[PDB]
Design a protein around this ligand. Structure first.
Ligand code: BCL
Ligand code: BCL
Ligand code: BCL
Ligand code: BCL
Ligand code: MQ8
Ligand code: UQ8
Ligand code: PGV
Ligand code: PGV
Ligand code: DGA
Ligand code: H4X
Ligand code: HEM
Ligand code: 8K6
Ligand code: CA
Ligand code: CA
Ligand code: CA
Ligand code: CA
Ligand code: FE
Ligand code: MG
Lengths: 318, 44, 66, 43, 66, 272, 74, 257, 44, 73, 72, 41
């Protein structure tokens, strides 16, 4: 057939690019850039350099302290054996305090290490937030990447710090494992009567499906007009060429309305952020306001009603 | 892997899930282990 | 114990009942039994939480193993 | 006007062979059904 | 089928509280676990992976001793 | 209505079936043979869903439900009131989805571009056909598919999941969820970056491609590029769909135990 | 009434022969698969009807297998 | 009592309403941002009169892009540059009918061969230099061995005939990668072909261009100066290759089945 | 404006000869396999 | 009606021979796999029918294995 | 019998090297598949305990039996 | 086309047929041994 533009057939090298000049008073960039042939088959081949200033070092100290703690407790749970660590790795975890301790600080091997790791991971993510903000603002760009990051951090803090405090127990938070955190997911659905009848859960699922749909559509459309220079979106925005025109006619003819080369990126932004906004809203109300989502859905006229034919006798009533 | 086909028993309204699933090769191991004991003649 | 179960618990074993063979199956020690699980070996100052292992009796999940 | 580039002679030729082939195919179908009726009658 | 299981639970507790655990005095050290308690009864001790033990053949009616 | 620049692109040709008979527009839409087909099948399917709601107990939007046949029908034909309506609607649905994809192909041919979007749509279609055709055929009955109803296909999803005691431990399910999550993350970052470069700090010029590379190399140390992020996008979404189809074709036809017990192959390797 | 179908051969001056051939072949294969699957799912099924004999049952009752299974009880 | 109810109104309900209203309102703002290109639209009336309409919701107020290196201001929604001179005949007498090109379809600029009217300036780097340039002007680039160097190969053209030979590679300095191949045609002109319309076979040492035919490489649009390319010229070149996807062979626009 | 494959009439005759020979041999092998299967395990 | 199939060899002037060959080969391989899998899932299965003998059962009742299993009890 | 004569011209329309690679890869995949299909049936030859069961043979060695006696 | 002349095609065909015959011979031998050890029909 015709070239599909999925891999780079011919590669070219020039000396590495150090980066746009920073404002005066900045630290130098660390690292000497290297090139990857395999990364260059699909994208850009340069790796590095990297910018390490004040906020991105405090972050990376916090995060690595947290990682050391989590790893060592997982390793103590098998008796220090690395062979068993590799053998049973998906079943290990660091577990939260027993719920009877409330919001106090428990002893170290009965939930205090969980508390330490949570605190250090929190600080890591807030320092990283400041780094992302300043990096985009020192180059003179809008700070749109910090708004979305803030939303994600808020969801991490909701399930984990805010909801456990509003409930009165640290033992309501997830543990640090793979299968352990999957077990937490299932159990919190079972305890509060079926998350499928949580309406914010349904809306966030709507927006996660929509993210996949929209990004398949956009990735397809821009690869399909890259023969007319469509992959260069900044120029198509500030001087509309034939690639943008064809891209917008396609969708107009197909489904009756369209966006522009700049507006589709606002649709992307919002579809990714409403998913997490509804995530926060659905978790923050569970347990603190609603105790059984299925009974809520029945009270508000939402759940179907299968035919019965039988009678089952509740043995606690007999 | 449990290669097809299977045996399925419906146990509820249609379109609701609610059914039990058997693999004929695994169920043979439970059948091959029961062995009801033999009767003892009733007493005078 | 067998007489008690066969007479007083028919809400569960209804008119089929149990004999010895229902559990011993011709051996003096039954095949599937349990005891209070201590858990894996961990450091001496670490108390057991009772989970996050393989868990052979709870269908190989990371759920509480006893 | 929509046309296929075949002249009238080419169309006549194609039609001859097309009809012969379709007749042979239907003959084989009839034979298969006679055998099936002899083995396992369904009506 | 949820209503027999409800009784089953209670039944098993009886077997273990009244009969099997008090036998921890009589049996040797061979029939005990790490924590020093005897072997006890589960759902698997008589079903053994079938929806009814031995598919529900009624053996116990032929013996008036049980 | 036509856009400012639209008239010079509305030419004839590029079709698959039909020809010059269905080559016109109605308003902004383009019709074609497959446009007629799609609207025909969508209208018929919708009207049959509504009738199946009329013969049920309620017209509440959340509680309508049309269910498939019983498992005793097998791969046969069910009565209209006990499953046949579901079969007719599920024929209409396939007709409409495939028509949609082929109409897309006609449009792209007319505008001179590549067939990436109908090709990515094909994988959604494949996941649907897995749930209504392939899995039911391998298990031996139409009554293994889901009913048509909001809130009522969710009961199906729940009970099917619990037929394996814990469906989170399904391996292809884990892989698909990984792709879904990473796709939402990537879409957020891409949206943010383009907006940020054409909407800079107050009183500044529009930035360039060098700025786009620099920002991510400063934060993270690697930048993938403006054309490869579109590729990465097509890739993550398609893979999500693909591994969903695999995870459902595995459950029932090729595995009947609990899903946690599959993973037992790993700690039983004779190498630890 | 006999001269009504004279110009029929001109059909191939408006309908493309190659496209038509491919369409016919593909449709016939699809229909063959479909009808075989529809008849196999009915009372007329000929693979599982145990005619002229049931072979799994025949294997379970071979004298050698029976004598081995009897020696497994003892 | 299993399903007893104490009070009908709760917080989850109100919050859900608030969300329905917060969506339903970003739709409004995004739909308004969608109409900074291509509007007001042209509605054709009962007997042919055309008016400008604007849709629902209405168009936003204009915003300004300030381009770098004194590249001017861009107001959007704003004026438009004039279309060129396409000729078209309608096929059926109603507003929704299709059009046919009047002359030679390859040299007409209609259909997949239409293009836009951009600036007559090159795209710039962050330093002010032209972005897309031949590899003899950018003296620091090199093709990575392990990859077939296309310089020297031939340009077979979709009907099996030869178009010409590759003589240069055009690179992109802002993001290092190949954008165009330059070739000498049958009448000794220098023409470009986009790299995303070329299948390169290293062993056959061929470049297959499925879009146009071999003799069609003589009429590809040419450049003013061969040390740079402008936005307008990029559009013209790419559009000429895109017209061949429907006009190269008389059978390409003619209903597969 | 007419579908062609670039084969002349001689080339088509050659291809047709070998195609028919190959198809006949293949069907012969199929028939032999089915006769053996009927002798071993008759299905009708 | 015996010289009715004379110009049949001209078929390859309108149908591409290479495309046809590839289509035939791929279809035949797919059909081979499919029919083998369909017959293996019926009463005609020939791998698990325990004819001419059951081999796992034959291994469980070997005198050496029986004498070793007795010596455990 | 001289009706397969121009057969050698097959390689003027089909690439020899691609065909060779395709054949080799297909044969390896099919080999693995058939071995796994036969191992999952009654014909399995690794676990059938013929000509003897070796784990069972190790459990009943006199030395192991006498050591297991001393632990109870 | 493949770029092979008619002589090169003849050569390739000769060796291809010889190799395929040898491979099928080895397959038949493996099956005779398996039938002697563990007959499956
Ligand atoms: C107790 C239940 C189990 C569970 C049981 C199941 C079951 C059962 C299934 C999944 C499936 C999925 N699960 Mg799960 N799942 C659970 C927990 C999770 C969790 C989580 C956070 O806990 C996540 C993130 C997921 C995520 C997922 C995805 C991997 C997958 C759904 C995407 C998909 O199928 O796309 C595929 C896309 C489609 C099917 C869409 C079809 C699109 C069609 C062609 C177009 C329709 C157009 C329409 C009619 C037009 C309307 C037009 C209007 C004009 C607008 N599951 C719990 C543990 N899960 C599903 C799956 O994998 O199926 C393949 C599935 O069947
Ligand atoms: C009780 C039910 C009967 C049964 C009743 C019928 C009936 C009735 C018919 C078939 C027909 C067919 N059956 Mg049956 N069939 C049964 C069981 C089988 C089984 C099996 C595993 O049990 C198989 C594999 C088959 C297979 C077949 C095909 C050979 C044929 C469908 C061909 C087709 O789709 O062409 C469509 C594809 C094309 C037209 C493309 C064009 C191909 C060209 C024309 C060349 C192809 C040759 C073709 C394969 C015929 C070979 C004949 C040669 C001269 C040897 N049947 C059972 C036993 N079967 C049909 C048939 O034989 O038609 C003639 C038919 O009418
Ligand atoms: C109860 C059922 C019988 C059985 C009944 C049948 C019947 C009936 C048939 C087969 C056929 C086949 N069987 Mg059987 N088969 C059984 C058990 C087996 C087992 C096994 C593990 O148990 C295997 C591996 C096979 C494998 C095979 C293939 C050799 C062949 C399918 C070829 C194909 O798909 O062409 C698809 C690929 C192509 C068409 C490409 C063509 C390439 C060219 C023509 C050369 C390739 C040669 C190829 C290997 C064929 C052998 C020719 C040589 C002389 C070796 N059968 C059981 C015992 N089997 C078919 C057959 O042999 O036809 C001749 C056939 O009709
Ligand atoms: C009960 C069933 C039998 C069994 C029945 C059969 C049957 C029947 C066959 C095999 C065949 C094979 N078996 Mg066995 N096999 C059994 C147990 C085993 C065990 C084991 C650990 O249990 C192993 C490792 C093998 C391995 C093998 C391979 C050597 C061979 C598959 C070749 C292949 O896939 O080539 C595919 C790869 C290619 C074609 C690539 C090209 C290879 C080139 C030509 C060079 C490679 C050299 C070649 C593989 C060896 C040539 C022989 C030399 C003179 C030594 N079998 C048991 C005991 N096995 C097949 C065979 O022997 O083929 C001739 C075969 O027909
Ligand atoms: C049904 C009925 C009663 C019919 C009667 C009417 C009659 C008689 C005939 C009409 C003719 C025909 C054939 C009509 C068919 C149309 C019908 C009826 C229905 C289809 C409408 C439909 C399926 C719409 C669904 C719309 C939805 C929900 C979309 C989901 C995704 C979404 C929200 C997208 C918003 C963002 C957008 C607009 C993305 C498109 C878009 C993308 C993705 C880019 O990448 C891109 C790149 C550069 C420039 C522009 C774009 C661009 O616009
Ligand atoms: C405008 O262009 C853009 C860039 O170029 C300038 C970018 O670099 C970037 C930054 C992007 C990156 C640095 C790459 C991000 C990488 C991700 C998300 C990796 C995920 C890919 C995988 C294959 C992991 C998935 C693997 C399994 C599930 C197994 C963006 C977002 C962008 O929009
Ligand atoms: C005598 C004592 C000597 C101390 C001399 C050094 C002065 C103190 C630090 C200087 C400073 O505060 O600088 C800031 C570093 O922030 C940082 O450490 C931030 C990290 C400080 C806190 C580290 C621990 C974190 C505390 C908990 C988390 C807070 C979360 C808040 C997030 C919103 C900003 O860094 P830069 O703008 O990149 O640097 C530019 C020049 O200043 C140097 O080239
Ligand atoms: C491509 C994906 C699938 C490929 C793998 C196929 C391999 C195995 C599938 C066969 C397993 C089916 C399930 C067996 C167990 C359930 C019982 C059953 O149905 O199996 C048999 C049917 O097999 C049947 O369809 C067999 C039908 C198989 C035909 C598959 C071909 C699909 C092509 C159609 C395209 C259009 C026995 O049928 P009956 O009991 O007489 O029917 C009675 C009821 O159906 C109606 O009154
Ligand atoms: C993250 C990993 C995602 C792997 C994708 C899922 C493959 C499922 C198994 C399919 C095999 C089959 O047709 O059936 C297998 C069946 C299901 O389960 C079984 O019998 C399996 C028995 C053991 C097989 C385990 C091998 C795992 C190797 C997979 C890739 C590397 C990890
Ligand atoms: C052996 O390994 C070594 C040591 C060598 C290092 C290797 C590290 C490795 C292999 C690590 C593996 C890690 C894994 C698999 C981690 C899995 C992590 C997952 C999937 C985690 C999922 C969820 C956890 C969440 C959401 C936790 C949220 C916790 C929060 C928000 C904590 C909040 C606590 C706070 C803010 C502190 C309050 C404390 C105080 C003092 C105020 O209380 C009064
Ligand atoms: C807590 C674990 C147990 C559970 C959940 C359980 C559950 C059940 C259920 C649900 C049934 C009805 C089966 C059906 O009608 O399909 C049943 C039947 C039966 N169970 Fe149990 N059981 C348990 C333990 C036991 C034990 C320990 C024994 C032996 C002492 C036992 C003996 C029986 C017998 C004999 C029947 C058949 C009674 C009948 O025919 O109705 N069960 N059990
Ligand atoms: C007045 C002449 C035209 C007649 C109207 C066209 C009716 C179209 C037929 C309905 C749809 C066809 C069914 C199958 C379509 C293809 C499936 C993908
Ligand atoms: Ca009692
Ligand atoms: Ca039969
Ligand atoms: Ca056999
Ligand atoms: Ca052996
Ligand atoms: Fe983009
Ligand atoms: Mg846990």
């Amino acid at each position: 057939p015709e070239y599909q533009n999925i891999f780079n057939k011919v590669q070219v090298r020039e000396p590495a690019y150090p980066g746009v000049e920073l404002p005066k008073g900045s630290l130098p960039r660390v690292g000497k850039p290297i090139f990857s042939y395999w990364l260059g088959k699909i994208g850009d081949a340069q790796i590095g350099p990297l910018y390490l200033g004040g906020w991105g070092i405090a972050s990376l100290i916090s995060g690595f302290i947290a990682l050391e703690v989590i790893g060592l407790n997982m390793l103590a749970s098998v008796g220090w054996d690395p062979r068993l660590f590799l053998k049973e790795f998906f079943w290990l975890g660091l577990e939260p305090p027993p719920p009877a301790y409330g919001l106090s600080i428990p002893p170290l091997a009965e939930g205090g290490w969980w508390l330490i790791a949570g605190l250090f991971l929190t600080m890591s993510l807030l320092l990283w937030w400041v780094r992302v903000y300043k990096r985009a603002k020192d180059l003179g760009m809008g700070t749109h990447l910090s708004w979305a990051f803030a939303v994600a951090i808020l969801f991490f803090l909701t399930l984990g710090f805010i909801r456990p405090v509003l409930m009165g127990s640290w033992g309501e938070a997830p543990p640090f494992g793979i299968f352990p955190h999957l077990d937490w997911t299932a159990a919190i659905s079972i305890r509060y009567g079926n998350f499928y009848y949580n309406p914010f859960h349904g809306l966030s699922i709507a927006f996660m499906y929509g993210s996949a749909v929209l990004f398949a559509m956009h990735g397809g459309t821009i690869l399909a007009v890259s023969r007319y220079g469509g992959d260069r979106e900044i120029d198509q925005i500030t001087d509309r060429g034939t690639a943008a025109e064809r891209a917008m006619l396609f969708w107009r003819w197909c489904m009756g309305f369209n966006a522009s080369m700049e507006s589709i990126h606002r649709w992307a932004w919002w579809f990714a952020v409403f998913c997490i906004i509804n995530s926060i809203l659905g978790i923050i109300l569970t347990g603190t306001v609603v105790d059984n989502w299925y009974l809520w859905a029945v009270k508000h006229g939402v759940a179907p009603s299968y035919p019965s034919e039988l009678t089952i006798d509740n043995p606690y009533l007999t | 892997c449990d290669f097809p086909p299977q045996d399925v028993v419906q146990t509820g309204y249609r379109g609701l899930g609610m059914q039990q699933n058997y693999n004929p090769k695994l169920l043979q191991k439970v059948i091959d282990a029961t062995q009801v004991p033999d009767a003892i003649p009733a007493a005078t | 114990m067998t007489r008690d179960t066969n007479s007083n618990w028919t809400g569960h074993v209804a008119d089929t009942g149990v004999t010895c063979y229902t559990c011993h199956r011709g051996k003096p020690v039954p095949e599937h039994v349990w005891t209070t699980d201590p858990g894996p070996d961990i450091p001496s100052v670490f108390p057991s939480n009772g989970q996050n292992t393989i868990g052979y009796n709870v269908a190989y999940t990371a759920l509480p193993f006893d | 006007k929509s046309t296929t580039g075949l002249t009238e002679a080419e169309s006549k030729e194609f039609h001859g062979i097309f009809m012969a082939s379709m007749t042979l195919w239907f003959g084989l179908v009839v034979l298969a059904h006679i055998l099936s009726w002899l083995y396992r009658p369904w009506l | 089928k949820r209503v027999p299981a409800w009784h089953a639970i209670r039944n098993v507790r009886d077997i273990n509280i009244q009969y099997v655990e008090p036998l921890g005095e009589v049996l040797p050290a061979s029939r005990k676990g790490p924590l020093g308690d005897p072997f006890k009864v589960n759902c698997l001790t008589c079903h053994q992976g079938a929806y009814k033990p031995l598919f529900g053949v009624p053996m116990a009616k032929d013996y008036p001793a049980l | 209505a036509l856009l400012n620049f639209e008239k010079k692109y509305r030419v004839r040709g590029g079709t698959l079936v039909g020809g010059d008979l269905f080559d016109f527009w109605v308003g902004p839409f383009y019709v074609g043979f497959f446009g007629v087909s799609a609207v025909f099948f969508a209208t018929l399917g919708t009207m049959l869903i509504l009738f199946g709601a009329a013969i049920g107990p309620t017209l509440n939007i959340w509680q309508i439900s049309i269910a498939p046949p019983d498992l005793s029908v097998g791969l046969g034909f069910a009565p209209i009131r006990e499953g046949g309506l579901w079969q007719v609607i599920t024929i209409c649905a396939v007709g409409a989805f495939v028509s949609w994809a082929l109409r897309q192909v006609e449009i792209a041919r007319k505008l001179g571009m590549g067939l990436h979007v109908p090709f990515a749509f094909s994988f959604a279609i494949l996941a649907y056909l897995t749930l209504v055709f392939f899995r039911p055929v391998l298990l031996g009955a139409w009554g293994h598919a889901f009913p048509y109803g909001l809130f009522s296909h969710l009961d199906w999803v729940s009970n099917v999941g619990y037929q394996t005691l814990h469906f989170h431990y399904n391996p292809a399910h884990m892989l698909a969820i990984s792709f879904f999550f990473i796709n939402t993350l990537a879409l957020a970052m891409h949206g943010s970056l383009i907006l940020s470069v054409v909407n800079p700090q107050k009183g500044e010029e529009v930035k360039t491609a060098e700025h786009e590379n620099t920002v991510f190399r400063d934060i993270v140390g690697y930048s993938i590029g403006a054309l490869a992020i579109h590729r990465l996008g097509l890739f993550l979404a398609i893979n999500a769909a693909f591994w969903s189809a695999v995870c459902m074709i595995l459950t029932g036809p090729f595995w009947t135990r609990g899903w946690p017990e599959w993973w037992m192959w790993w700690p039983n390797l004779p190498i630890w | 009434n006999a001269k009504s179908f004279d110009g029929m051969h001109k059909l191939w001056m408006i309908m493309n022969p190659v496209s038509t051939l491919w369409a016919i072949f593909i449709f016939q294969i699809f229909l063959g698969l479909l009808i075989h699957m529809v008849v196999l799912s009915s009372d007329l099924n000929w693979h599982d009807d145990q005619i002229p004999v049931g072979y799994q049952l025949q294997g379970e009752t071979l004298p050698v297998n029976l004598e081995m299974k009897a020696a497994l009880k003892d | 009592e299993f399903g007893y109810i104490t009070q009908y109104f709760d917080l989850a309900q109100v919050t859900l309403w608030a969300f329905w209203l917060s969506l339903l309102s970003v739709i409004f703002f995004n739909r308004r941002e969608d109409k900074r290109e291509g509007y007001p639209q042209e509605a054709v009336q009962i007997f042919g009169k055309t008016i400008l309409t604007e849709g629902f919701p209405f168009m936003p107020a204009p915003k300004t892009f300030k381009l770098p290196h004194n590249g001017g201001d861009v107001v959007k929604p704003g004026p438009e540059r004039p279309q060129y001179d396409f000729k078209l005949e309608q096929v059926d007498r109603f507003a929704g009918a299709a059009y046919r090109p009047v002359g030679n379809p390859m040299l007409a600029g209609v259909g997949p061969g239409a293009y836009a009217v951009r600036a007559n300036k090159p795209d710039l780097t962050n330093a002010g230099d032209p972005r897309i340039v031949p590899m003899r002007v950018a003296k620091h680039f090199a093709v990575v061995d392990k990859d077939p160097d296309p310089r020297g190969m031939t340009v077979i053209g979709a009907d099996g005939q030869v178009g010409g030979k590759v003589t240069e590679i055009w690179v992109d300095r802002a993001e290092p990668q190949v954008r165009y191949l330059e070739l000498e045609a049958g009448n000794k002109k220098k023409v470009l072909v986009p790299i995303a319309l070329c299948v390169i076979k290293g062993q056959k040492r061929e470049v297959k261009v499925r879009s146009i035919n071999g003799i069609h490489f003589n009429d590809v649009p040419t450049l003013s100066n061969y040390d740079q390319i402008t936005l307008a010229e990029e559009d013209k070149v790419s559009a000429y290759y895109g017209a061949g996807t429907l006009y190269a062979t008389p059978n390409r626009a003619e209903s597969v089945l | 404006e007419k579908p062609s494959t670039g084969l002349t009439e001689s080339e088509a005759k050659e291809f047709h000869g070998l195609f028919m020979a190959s198809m006949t041999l293949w069907f012969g092998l199929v028939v032999l396999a089915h006769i053996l299967s009927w002798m071993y395990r008759p299905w009708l």
